[PDB]
Design a protein around this ligand. Sequence first.
Ligand code: COA
Ligand code: CL
Length: 156
Amino acid sequence: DFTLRNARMDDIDQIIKINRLTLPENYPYYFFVEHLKEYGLAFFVAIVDNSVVGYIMPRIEWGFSNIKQLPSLVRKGHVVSIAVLEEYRRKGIATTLLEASMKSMKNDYNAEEIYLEVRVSNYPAIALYEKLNFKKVKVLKGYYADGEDAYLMARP
Ligand SMILES: CC(C)(COP(=O)(O)OP(=O)(O)OC[C@H]1O[C@@H](n2cnc3c(N)ncnc32)[C@H](O)[C@@H]1OP(=O)(O)O)[C@@H](O)C(=O)NCCC(=O)NCCS
Ligand SMILES: [Cl-]
């Protein structure tokens, strides 16, 4: 089984290692640090045997809604990055990380809606998000480097 706690500065080495093994968007270390500094309460790691096997990196934003029809300014949570090491997948880790991060986005940071972007080919993640009541809002054409479309997904 696994446990969740808030990420700490000394987790970043392991967070970056997971990021680089699992995802092509390889953000600089300082990028991870900025999110930990500003939105840390909603930045979680999953722990198995005193090591990090998963994380969720959040951002809290203010701007136009991705959900309302008429332009509408809101406080919104943004899932920037989420990953689980291969060996530890399908154990409910990402679900747990997401539920924990979303709680904090709303309760610590006053987020009113939550959104993310995902590769249209990333069926495991799309399935995860739809389980947690995210809906496809629109296709961001050619969002990824090389040209892959993203779904913008958002949750009221
Ligand atoms: C997407 C990812 C974070 C899922 O992590 P996870 O801990 O394995 O997810 P969970 O175990 O909580 O799964 C929750 C739901 O996700 C879906 N899912 C996860 N992996 C799946 C897969 N291999 N095939 C089909 N559905 C999958 C299922 O609907 C699952 O619900 P269920 O098993 O009860 O039916 C993980 O596969 C991953 O680390 N991928 C690489 C990084 C990445 O793509 N992150 C997202 C970028 S936007
Ligand atoms: Cl691409």
